[PDB]
């Protein structure tokens, strides 16, 4: 019964939508839990539109706006194949460098944490981004990596190189190791 | 030294009366047809519509078991022309019944036709024969043309062609007609073309034939 | 309501292309008034093949009003065309 | 269910949806019967059950209509395009956009446990068992239609691990090969049901997950051929799958049959650096991989007796066999072949009827007869 409803609201916000894309502009402006950007995007066809102020809505100096706006993207290159989608992807991993280049230690941990399964998504929406992707996974790896012999840890996983409530460095790099098994997982099933 | 001889030297009676000759020896002989088709292809240039349209029919009946390694250009080439309506279809009643065994002789002859099509928009139902037939009659050749043949890149979206264009039909009954024998020829499609597969075989039943795919049952 | 003033229409070939730039649109809304009209105009184009390709892709959509207009102009279609009715 | 009334059960019909308001309100056993059994009114309320039910009562009847019970109580046609129809009905999928999916991507499915996948292959290959006038054609296209819907329930790889490790004993009306065939739409990554549909030995026809990918193989090899970065990944690639799944390569074969013709080009093969040459050396690397296939059946030896008169052409037009080790691998290939089988060695020796007299060499005459 919850997937009728879904359905349902999905045909109203597509109608909505279509009526004037500004409702459409704001809403993702302000964002709404990660969780329905799938049934957004797989439901409502006017999300096509919302690849026109990715760019606009990642150059915001609000932070959870970027993630928003990383997720977003994902979900919708998953959904919509198309070089306008393939560009801002490119954008995206631009972005994502650059804010590498200029954030603190804990808002990195809170901006990487959230966002890399959409590079699981970049990736396999589009092989051409691989290398560029795989470059900026390193680069985040190292660098978390040499915040973890910043202070001392009570997990150490720099010498667990073989296979709760925790440090964020430690969390944040199996964060990332996580998501490469997602990638090669996804690169060896992928045909 | 007879033939080498038997041919350039007057008008259409002595090269018709020659020729004829080379069908039925040809026909009697399961061998020589190697020789009578290198010495078929040479006279294309005879300058005579007559001469032309009985060389058509002196090749096509010696159209069996004979393939075309080299000298396919030039019979693929000769439908260059103003009108020639009958060498026009006579030709695309040579196409339909020769064999080939090469790959870039399907694609020379492929877009050749196309360039054809898109000079002359006036013989699109024999063309759909003629490569109706040339699906038919091999299928086995074309398998590595789809992948280069039609936009099927790997992670762009391929938009819908045109469906109401007549010159992806024909290339569609190429497909479809090809498609019959061989088994690896399904998982290559995309979505749009089985919605393009149900419009054919709904429209033109007599170009396109009956497939086992999932979508059509 | 002018069904009987729809064969005078000269320039029929400029009108239905005008009527027929919609259904490549997205609200589901609109595509089963364009599907509606194209049954209405059903007298005038009997025999035009992108119309019944759009009534076969729209006859299996999941739109409900989508569904209703298709099956409303595949009646109209279907008493005057062959290929359609056997389609 | 009782009385065999012939028009008035329909008024029947009627009042039973005219006072019994779902379709399963208070007897279920009668009703699941009624049903399911081992009538003509039957599809008229089994849509309405599609469409009338609650989806608890929804449930319930798919738990116990795919229940593990040994007395075949449900009709197998009946029970399967009920789950067929509660995959698509129109209520779920009210608004999304329709056709233009991702093939990559899977949007949804339904999930069933364990037993449940079992109790429901067992039951559609008791529906494929039954074979009365409908014969193995017939078999294969029923079996297709009512795959997606197994490749739906499953959707992931322990729980193909855990079909395809079932094998049923038996030798006749086994139908178990089907899905030993159709683990190539699974696209298995193990060689050991790979094995299993090897001894099994039957025809392949239906398409295959990974039959792009081995497409874009061949294109890869046929460009590395016709070059002379990728030329490396075109040689590594085709011998990996081709060593890791024999049946796929052995579909392939007919596709890369049509290429290396060429030969013709470069007879002495001085221009061709490699157009000639690699191209060759790679195919021949193939089927001395593949001889476990080259003496495969009937219905696959026409490829192959194709590539060999390819071959002996192409060595015909040689420069007087300026590359030996070529010619002699050809040879040891075609003596494994001709040991391998004897229709094979006739068909041999029916080409060479005519190739080894033009041949007339010392290595052809020496095959026309450590630690």
Same mark, same amino acid.
């Given at each position: 019964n919850l997937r009728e409803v879904q359905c349902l609201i999905c045909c109203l916000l597509h109608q909505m939508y279509i009526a004037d894309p500004n409702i459409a502009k704001l809403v993702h402006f302000q964002?709404?839990?990660?969780?329905?950007?799938?049934?957004?995007?797989?439901?409502?066809?006017?999300?096509?539109?919302?690849?026109?102020?990715?760019?606009?809505?990642?150059?915001?100096?609000?932070?959870?706006?970027?993630?928003?706006?990383?997720?977003?993207?994902?979900?919708?290159?998953?959904?919509?194949?198309?070089?306008?989608?393939?560009?801002?992807?490119?954008?995206?991993?631009?972005?994502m460098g650059t804010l590498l280049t200029v954030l603190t230690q804990a808002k990195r941990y809170a901006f990487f944490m959230p966002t890399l399964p959409s590079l699981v998504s970049f990736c396999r929406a589009f092989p051409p981004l691989y290398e560029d992707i795989m470059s900026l996974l390193i680069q985040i790896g190292q660098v978390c990596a040499s915040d973890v012999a910043t202070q001392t840890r009570d997990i150490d996983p720099i010498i667990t190189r073989l296979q709760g409530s925790m440090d964020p460095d430690v969390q944040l790099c199996h964060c990332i190791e996580r998501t490469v098994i997602e990638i090669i997982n996804m690169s060896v099933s992928g045909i | 030294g007879a033939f080498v001889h038997g041919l350039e030297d007057e008008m259409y009676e002595v090269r018709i009366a020659a020729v004829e000759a080379l069908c039925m020896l040809a026909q009697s002989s399961p061998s020589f047809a190697e020789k009578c088709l290198d010495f078929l292809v040479d006279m294309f240039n005879d300058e005579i519509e007559e001469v032309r349209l009985q060389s058509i029919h002196t090749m096509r009946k010696i159209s069996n078991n004979i393939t075309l390694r080299e000298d396919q250009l030039d019979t693929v080439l000769a439908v260059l022309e103003d009108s020639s309506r009958d060498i026009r279809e006579a030709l695309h009643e040579l196409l339909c019944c020769t064999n080939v065994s090469t790959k870039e002789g399907i694609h020379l002859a492929l877009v050749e036709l196309l360039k054809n099509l898109t000079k002359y928009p006036t013989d699109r139902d024999s063309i759909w024969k003629c490569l109706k037939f040339l699906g038919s009659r091999h299928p086995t050749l074309v398998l590595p043309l789809v992948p280069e043949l039609l936009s099927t890149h790997p992670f762009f979206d391929t938009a819908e062609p045109d469906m109401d264009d007549p010159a992806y039909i024909a290339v569609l009954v190429l497909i479809?007609?090809?498609?019959?024998?061989?088994?690896?020829?399904?998982?290559?499609?995309?979505?749009?073309?089985?919605?393009?597969?149900?419009?054919?075989?709904?429209?033109?039943?007599?170009?396109?034939?009956?497939?086992?795919?999932?979508?059509?049952? | 309501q002018s069904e009987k003033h729809l064969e005078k229409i000269l320039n029929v070939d400029?009108?239905?292309?005008?009527?027929?730039?919609?259904?490549?649109?997205?609200?589901?809304?609109?595509?089963?008034?364009?599907?509606?009209?194209?049954?209405?105009?059903?007298?005038? %184009?009997?025999?035009?093949?992108?119309?019944?390709?759009? %009534?076969?892709?729209?006859?299996?959509?999941?739109?409900?009003?989508?569904?209703?207009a298709a099956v409303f102009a595949a009646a109209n279609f279907s008493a005057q065309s062959k290929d359609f009715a056997v389609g | 269910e009782a009385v065999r009334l012939g028009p008035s059960?329909? *008024?029947?019909?009627?009042?039973?949806?005219?006072?019994?308001?779902?379709?399963?309100?208070?007897?279920?056993?009668?009703?699941?019967?009624? $049903?399911?059994?081992?009538?003509?009114?039957?599809?008229?309320? *089994?849509?309405?059950?599609?469409?009338?039910?609650?989806?608890?009562?929804?449930?319930?009847?798919?738990?116990?209509?795919?229940?593990?019970?040994?007395?075949?109580?449900?009709?197998?046609?009946?029970? *399967?395009?009920?789950?067929?129809?509660?995959?698509?009905?129109?209520?779920?999928?009210?608004?999304? =956009?329709?056709?233009?999916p991702q093939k990559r991507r899977e949007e949804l499915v339904l999930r069933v446990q364990g037993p449940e996948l079992i109790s429901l292959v067992e039951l559609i290959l008791a529906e494929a068992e039954t074979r009365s006038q409908d014969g193995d054609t017939a078999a294969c296209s029923l079996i297709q239609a009512r795959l997606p819907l197994l490749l739906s329930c499953c959707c992931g790889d322990d729980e193909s691990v855990r079909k395809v490790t079932e094998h049923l004993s038996g030798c006749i009306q086994q139908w178990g090969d089907s899905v030993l065939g159709r683990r190539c739409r699974d696209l298995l990554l193990q060689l050991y049901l790979q094995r299993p549909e090897l001894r099994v030995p039957v025809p392949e026809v239906l398409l295959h997950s990974e039959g792009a990918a081995s497409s874009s193989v061949c294109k890869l090899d046929g460009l590395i051929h016709r070059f002379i970065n990728r030329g490396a990944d075109?040689?590594?690639?085709?011998?990996?799958?081709?060593?890791?799944?024999?049946?796929?390569?052995?579909?392939?074969?007919?596709?890369?049959?049509?290429? *290396?013709?060429?030969?013709?080009?470069?007879?002495? +093969?001085?221009?061709?650096?490699?157009?000639?040459?690699?191209?060759?050396?790679?195919?021949?690397?193939?089927?001395?991989?593949?001889?476990?296939?080259?003496?495969?059946?009937?219905? +696959?030896?026409?490829?192959?007796?194709?590539?060999?008169?390819?071959?002996?052409?192409? $060595?015909?037009?040689?420069?007087?066999?300026?590359?030996?080790?070529?010619?002699?691998?050809?040879?040891?290939?075609?003596?494994?072949?001709?040991?391998?089988?004897?229709?094979? @060695? @006739?068909?041999?020796? $029916?080409?060479?009827?005519? =190739?080894?007299?033009? =041949?007339?060499?010392?290595?052809?005459?020496?095959?026309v007869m450590t630690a």
């Open positions: 964002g709404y839990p990660c969780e329905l950007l799938p049934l957004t995007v797989a439901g409502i066809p006017s999300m096509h539109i919302c690849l026109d102020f990715i760019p606009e809505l990642i150059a915001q100096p609000e932070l959870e706006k970027q993630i928003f706006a990383i997720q977003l993207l994902s979900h919708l290159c998953i959904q919509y194949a198309l070089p306008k989608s393939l560009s801002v992807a490119r954008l995206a991993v631009n972005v | 479809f007609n090809a498609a019959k024998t061989c088994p690896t020829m399904p998982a290559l499609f995309s979505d749009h073309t089985f919605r393009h597969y149900a419009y054919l075989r709904d429209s033109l039943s007599h170009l396109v034939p009956a497939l086992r795919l999932p979508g059509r049952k | 400029e009108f239905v292309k005008r009527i027929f730039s919609v259904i490549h649109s997205n609200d589901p809304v609109a595509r089963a008034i364009t599907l509606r009209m194209l049954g209405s105009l059903a007298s005038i %184009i009997p025999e035009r093949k992108n119309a019944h390709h759009s %009534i076969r892709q729209s006859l299996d959509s999941h739109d409900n009003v989508e569904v209703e | 059960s329909g *008024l029947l019909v009627d009042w039973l949806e005219m006072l019994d308001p779902e379709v399963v309100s208070s007897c279920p056993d009668l009703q699941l019967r009624l $049903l399911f059994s081992r009538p003509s009114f039957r599809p008229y309320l *089994l849509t309405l059950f599609t469409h009338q039910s609650s989806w608890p009562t929804l449930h319930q009847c798919i738990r116990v209509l795919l229940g593990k019970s040994r007395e075949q109580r449900f009709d197998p046609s009946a029970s *399967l395009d009920f789950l067929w129809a509660c995959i698509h009905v129109p209520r779920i999928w009210q608004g999304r =956009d329709q056709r233009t075109a040689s590594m690639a085709c011998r990996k799958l081709a060593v890791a799944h024999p049946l796929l390569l052995l579909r392939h074969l007919p596709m890369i049959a049509a290429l *290396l013709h060429g030969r013709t080009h470069l007879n002495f +093969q001085e221009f061709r650096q490699q157009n000639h040459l690699s191209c060759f050396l790679h195919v021949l690397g193939l089927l001395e991989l593949l001889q476990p296939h080259v003496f495969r059946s009937e219905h +696959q030896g026409a490829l192959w007796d194709c590539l060999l008169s390819f071959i002996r052409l192409l $060595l015909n037009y040689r420069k007087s066999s300026r590359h030996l080790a070529a010619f002699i691998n050809k040879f040891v290939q075609f003596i494994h072949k001709y040991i391998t089988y004897n229709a094979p @060695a @006739a068909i041999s020796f $029916l080409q060479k009827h005519a =190739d080894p007299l033009h =041949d007339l060499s010392f290595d052809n005459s020496d095959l």
